[PDB]
Design a protein around this ligand. Structure first.
Ligand SMILES: OC[C@H]1O[C@H](O[C@H]2[C@H](O)[C@@H](O)[C@@H](O)O[C@@H]2CO)[C@H](O)[C@@H](O)[C@@H]1O
Length: 682
């Protein structure tokens, strides 16, 4: 409550208000602004400048007197001239797209500026330039079943599924985030509180494709034990993923393989070592974190992250951490090996995808942040504002807000590092795939920062440099030939809708929500061309779930809808929605005349299941994502928002193996039909 404070909040990028649940402006408190400012950290040319290619590129200069300048391209090319302080000058025409370096010199000293030249648009594959309408499978990798996996779906299931998807006309397989989690705490299974967004989840390693597992005689002996084969059988046959058991199976197997691998002095060792070198420090600190984490839980299972570790292991420059790394070289190497194996197996999937000429092949998903106590915050502390957490404001459909427990990346550090952490984020998630889904793409404009320990309603939007981030996103998308899907559900200001579209970002449409206030559903053909349409997501009921009001009913049982008055409204809302959707299924040719017209009298059938998927398949959406859960007519969800211990999230497997579902007449017929819908959607 002073102008000092308000002025300070604005310069730092804290919006002074927001639109509440009731659609009214709501001002951010003095207290909130103080906490968030305290949560943040603390020239002739700026440290960085972003330009769009094909356009004029002026560089304003400050200071006094004359400067010389030197611009060096990413490719080695040099350009020079001179400039007076106070004036502006244009950089050379037709600068190629990429990362170049400008340096002004006056007498002794020099000021550096990273100069980024970006295309306007993200990459789009030719098929989509040609207005083809494509479909792919959207899977939660961990749910997959097969006759060869070890109780969790993995990279080997991913490879075998690609074939069956390609043969049926599908263009991609999309994945939940496969970001590294916590092999020392295998029950923290959430893909969305990851250790690092750069490295991978080692649990998806297919141990059957690891040659040293097969060449290790100790591994063979262990494998053939009745106690091993039993544990394995139990892990595989269970209908929920046993993360602790599957993890111990794989770590036991890979430790033994690794004893074999380590002795190698051949191509494979060289390639592993060359990978380690090329990835640099970030990879090193990931392995080190995993190795140290493994040690800490041996003392105490409840050492979930570095903030729970002794003081001496919280500071990466502490001598005790240096000592640990020194004294545990072989541990560090092993967790570096797992990352190599994860990356190589994913890369092998990618290649299969491209041998089948899949226009997208693999579709990765980038979660919106990292956990507070993982490897990323361990080794890059100043980038993250540990005194705040990213969430969402209180709204109509959640009128107490959400706190997702992730420390926000400081916007002023992103820019002070010339966008380095954002560049490296994209580099790690655009490799070996055709598309990237960016979770909560609004994050590039703003995040809801909540002061640590406070309720979501104490938060405020903190801004990020959206225009530079979009240009860099498009540049990296183009360099990787990786298209971008921006998950943009709910409230998007019209300005950002336009930016996103003109930046070639594909929008994200969920069938359930695509209806107006009277429950009139948007026609298939009025879906935006530059989008991906899906029926549901991992956060929502499956098709059967939704029709049966299973999300509402299960949710009640788990304590999520205490307020009975509101729950009555939701059930009514669903009955009205189902009716409007049924109406639209009939009206836009998705059902036979025999199908009932009154939703409340109808249960889910193979005919109705198919009609719901036909509806989105018929859409003008360039991309269509189909859940295998829906091909299998499954009722039960894989994640329930706002639960942790109350439901086994990230655990419900598919009801059938890959082998079994692609041998099934119904599944095949269904996929044949939807492939036809897409190709006839014009
Ligand atoms: O990180 C805690 C948070 O994880 C999940 O929420 C995700 C959601 O699954 C994503 O699809 C997207 O909306 O970002 C969310 C924030 O991470 C769980 O669904 C949720 O229960 C939990 O709070």
């Amino acid at each position: 409550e002073s102008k000092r404070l308000d002025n300070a909040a604005l310069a730092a990028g804290i919006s002074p208000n927001y639109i509440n649940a009731h659609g009214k402006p709501q001002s951010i408190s003095a207290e909130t602004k103080r906490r968030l400012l305290d949560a943040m950290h603390q020239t002739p040319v700026p440290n960085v400048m972003v330009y769009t290619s094909g356009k004029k590129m002026p560089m304003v200069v400050e200071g006094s007197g004359e400067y010389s300048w030197l611009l060096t391209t990413e490719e080695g090319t040099q350009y020079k001239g001179h400039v007076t302080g106070g004036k502006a000058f244009n950089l050379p025409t037709k600068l190629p797209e990429g990362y170049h370096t400008l340096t002004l010199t006056q007498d002794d000293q020099r000021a550096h500026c990273r100069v980024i030249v970006a295309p306007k648009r993200c990459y789009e594959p030719q098929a989509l330039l040609n207005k083809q309408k494509l479909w792919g499978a959207c899977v939660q990798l961990y749910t997959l079943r097969s006759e060869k996996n070890w109780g969790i779906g993995d990279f080997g299931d991913l490879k075998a599924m690609l074939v069956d998807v390609a043969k049926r006309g599908g263009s991609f397989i999309g994945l939940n985030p496969i970001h590294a989690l916590y092999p020392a705490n295998p029950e923290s299974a959430s893909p969305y509180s990851p250790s690092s967004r750069r490295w991978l989840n080692v649990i998806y390693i297919d141990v059957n494709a690891v040659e040293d597992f097969h060449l290790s005689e100790e591994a063979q002996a262990w494998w053939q034990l009745p106690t091993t084969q039993q544990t394995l059988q139990q892990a595989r046959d269970a209908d929920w993923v046993d993360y602790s058991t599957v993890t111990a199976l794989k770590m036991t197997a890979l430790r033994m393989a690794w004893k074999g691998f380590a002795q190698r002095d051949d191509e494979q060792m060289a390639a592993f070592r060359q990978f380690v070198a090329e990835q640099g420090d970030s990879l090193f600190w990931q392995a080190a974190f995993d190795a140290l984490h493994a040690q800490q839980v041996k003392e105490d299972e409840m050492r979930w992250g570095w903030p729970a570790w002794p003081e001496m292991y919280q500071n990466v420059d502490s001598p005790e951490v240096r000592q640990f790394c020194e004294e545990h070289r072989d541990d560090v190497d092993f967790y570096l090996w797992l990352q190599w194996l994860a990356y190589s197996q994913f890369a092998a999937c990618w290649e299969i995808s491209q041998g089948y000429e899949m226009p997208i092949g693999l579709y990765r998903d980038l979660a919106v942040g990292v956990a507070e106590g993982g490897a990323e915050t361990w080794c890059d502390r100043e980038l993250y504002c540990l005194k705040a957490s990213v969430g969402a404001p209180p709204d109509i459909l959640g009128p107490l807000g959400q706190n997702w427990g992730l420390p926000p990346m400081d916007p002023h550090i992103i820019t002070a590092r010339a966008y380095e952490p954002f560049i490296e984020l994209l580099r790690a998630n655009m490799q070996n795939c055709g598309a990237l889904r960016i979770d909560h793409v609004m994050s590039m404009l703003r995040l809801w920062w909540i002061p640590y320990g406070e309720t979501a309603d104490q938060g405020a939007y903190v801004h990020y440099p959206v225009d530079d981030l979009l240009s860099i996103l498009a540049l990296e998308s183009k360099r990787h030939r990786c298209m971008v899907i921006g998950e943009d559900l709910g409230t998007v200001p019209v300005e950002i809708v336009g930016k996103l579209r003109s930046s070639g970002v594909y929008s994200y449409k969920v069938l359930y929500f695509e209806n107006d206030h009277e429950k009139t559903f948007r026609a298939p053909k009025a879906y935006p061309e530059q989008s991906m349409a899906v029926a549901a997501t991992h956060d929502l009921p499956t098709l059967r779930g939704y029709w049966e009001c299973g999300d509402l009913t299960l949710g009640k049982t788990l304590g999520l809808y205490p307020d009975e008055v509101v729950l009555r409204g939701l059930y009514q809302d669903r009955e009205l929605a189902k009716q409007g959707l049924l109406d639209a299924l009939h009206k836009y040719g998705c059902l036979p005349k025999r199908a009932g017209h009154k939703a409340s009298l109808m249960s889910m059938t193979p005919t109705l299941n198919r009609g719901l998927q036909r509806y989105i398949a018929d859409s003008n959406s360039a991309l269509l994502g189909l859940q295998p859960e829906d091909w299998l007519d499954m009722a039960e969800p894989v994640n329930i928002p706002g639960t942790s211990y109350q439901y086994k999230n990230w655990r419900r497997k598919l009801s059938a193996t890959l082998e079994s579902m692609f041998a099934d007449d119904g599944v095949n017929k269904l996929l044949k039909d939807l492939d036809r819908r897409r190709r006839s959607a014009h």
